[PDB]
């Protein structure tokens, strides 16, 4: 149980580069090949390239010929994936990763005279352990704490004895932000949306929960809202 | 080099066997012999859980209603009495022409009868139009299948390019889906009009609902 730390959180411009680390607890990346995948959000994955433990093979998609480059420092101790020319395009979640392959000899003809004609090949055979990753937004957006705006029940929001309450979580840039209820005491049928990205470039978002319309009058419900990226946390009362 | 995995989305029935499959252009077996075809599972949150690994053998702790066949060409991954721990979305991976590459992914869901969302509408705080801007927001709660529609009237005129929606990811207890749709306008634009609705279109209602409420009272 290999575990793999990776560099934190980065916002660049467009057309600017990023330079990802990794590193692997006991120096593992000497004795197993490193992976890089990336996925953007609500999308596939996507194979970028790899290096073998052996330091003697690099390889990369098409898409990113060019574009990447896949180092490491002696003794392996960390890993290094730069990708440059950024668009929104790019903007994903890098992960580094570990992988066991398959190093097979291809070609071999038998040279009665001297050393053999061979060549190898590597095979891939198993991705093994997946970073947390990192997170690149490619974005000319400046650090921007969000409002926190109620989403009042009313008669609006209820019906057959449950009514519907949430916060709108407006105008933040970058991702993430985390929510939740009465300091996570409440987890029954709260619903936090994923966010969506405004043409301002800023991110919005709403969590909502559903409760009984009986504890309106005696419950207190209060959505707690953290941005760390701004230092920002927001405890809103929510009233009817 | 290309692979296609189908189907795109696959329902399934708990406790009903599922049935993936994973097609190349160009054979994945080894002169040797091994098919270098690899099967991941990536749920909700989570990085991919290798399941199968040269097309037939499951990963270390990967319960064995997982299994993986084929050659060649042509391979598939069956998951029997599927749970909503199966859910998620279903990646293979070809490793013998370099370079290496991911499938599309099949998507997985547990499929369910049908629900139509309970529709409920949030005006503008008076907080946010203070600061003059108007979000009103409409939930849909609870629905099944996966498919809905949101249509913003204001005083009944259509309204379009000032909204955005966000759906949930399937309850793993009710097998639902939830979803949000936010009409945003200036205060001067939304002083101007009296009724603000949400219509809403789904296979679980005969004919549309209207949530509306009137600005003020």
């Known amino acids: 149980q290999v575990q793999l730390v990776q560099s934190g959180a980065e916002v660049k411009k467009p057309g600017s580069s990023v330079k990802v680390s990794c590193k692997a607890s006991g120096n593992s990346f000497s004795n197993h090949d490193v992976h890089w995948v990336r996925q953007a959000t609500g999308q596939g994955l996507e194979w970028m390239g790899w290096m073998s433990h052996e330091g003697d093979k690099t390889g990369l998609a098409q898409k990113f010929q060019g574009r990447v480059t896949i180092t490491r420092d002696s003794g392996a101790s960390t890993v290094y994936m730069e990708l440059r020319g950024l668009t929104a395009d790019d903007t994903a979640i890098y992960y580094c990763?570990?992988?066991?392959?398959?190093?097979?000899?291809?070609?071999?003809?038998?040279?009665?005279?001297?050393?053999?004609?061979?060549?190898?090949?590597?095979?891939?055979?198993?991705?093994?352990?997946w970073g947390h990753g990192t997170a690149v937004t490619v974005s000319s957006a400046s650090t921007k704490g969000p409002s926190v705006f109620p989403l009042a029940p009313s008669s609006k929001s209820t019906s057959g004895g449950t009514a519907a309450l949430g916060c709108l979580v407006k105008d933040y840039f970058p991702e993430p932000v985390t929510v939740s209820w009465n300091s996570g005491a409440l987890t029954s049928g709260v619903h936090t949306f994923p966010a969506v990205l405004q043409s301002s470039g800023l991110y919005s978002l709403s969590s909502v929960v559903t409760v009984p319309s009986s504890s309106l009058g005696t419950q207190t419900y209060i959505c707690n809202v953290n941005h760390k990226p701004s230092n920002t946390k927001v405890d809103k009362k929510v009233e009817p | 080099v290309v692979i296609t995995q189908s189907p795109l989305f696959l329902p399934v029935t708990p406790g009903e066997a599922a049935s993936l499959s994973c097609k190349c252009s160009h054979s994945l077996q080894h002169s040797t012999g091994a098919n270098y075809l690899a099967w991941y599972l990536q749920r909700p949150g989570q990085t991919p859980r290798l399941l199968i690994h040269?097309?037939?053998h499951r990963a270390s702790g990967v319960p064995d209603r997982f299994s993986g066949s084929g050659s060649g060409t042509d391979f598939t991954l069956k998951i029997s009495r599927v749970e909503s721990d199966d859910v998620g979305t279903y990646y293979c991976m070809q490793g013998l022409h370099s370079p290496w590459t991911f499938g599309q992914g099949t998507k997985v869901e547990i499929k369910r009868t049908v629900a139509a969302p309970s529709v409920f509408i949030f005006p503008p705080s008076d907080e946010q139009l203070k600061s003059g801007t108007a979000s009103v927001v409409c939930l849909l709660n609870n629905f099944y299948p996966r498919e809905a529609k949101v249509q913003w009237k204001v005083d009944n005129a259509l309204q379009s390019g000032n909204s955005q929606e966000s759906v949930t990811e399937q309850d793993s207890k009710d097998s639902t889906y939830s979803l949000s749709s936010t009409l945003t306008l200036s205060k001067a634009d939304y002083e101007k009009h009296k009724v603000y609705a949400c219509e809403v279109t789904h296979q679980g209602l005969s004919s549309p609902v209207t949530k509306s409420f009137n600005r003020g009272e």
């Open positions: 040269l097309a037939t």
């Open positions: 990763l570990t992988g066991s392959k398959h190093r097979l000899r291809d070609y071999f003809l038998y040279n009665e005279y001297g050393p053999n004609y061979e060549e190898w090949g590597d095979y891939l055979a198993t991705l093994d352990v």
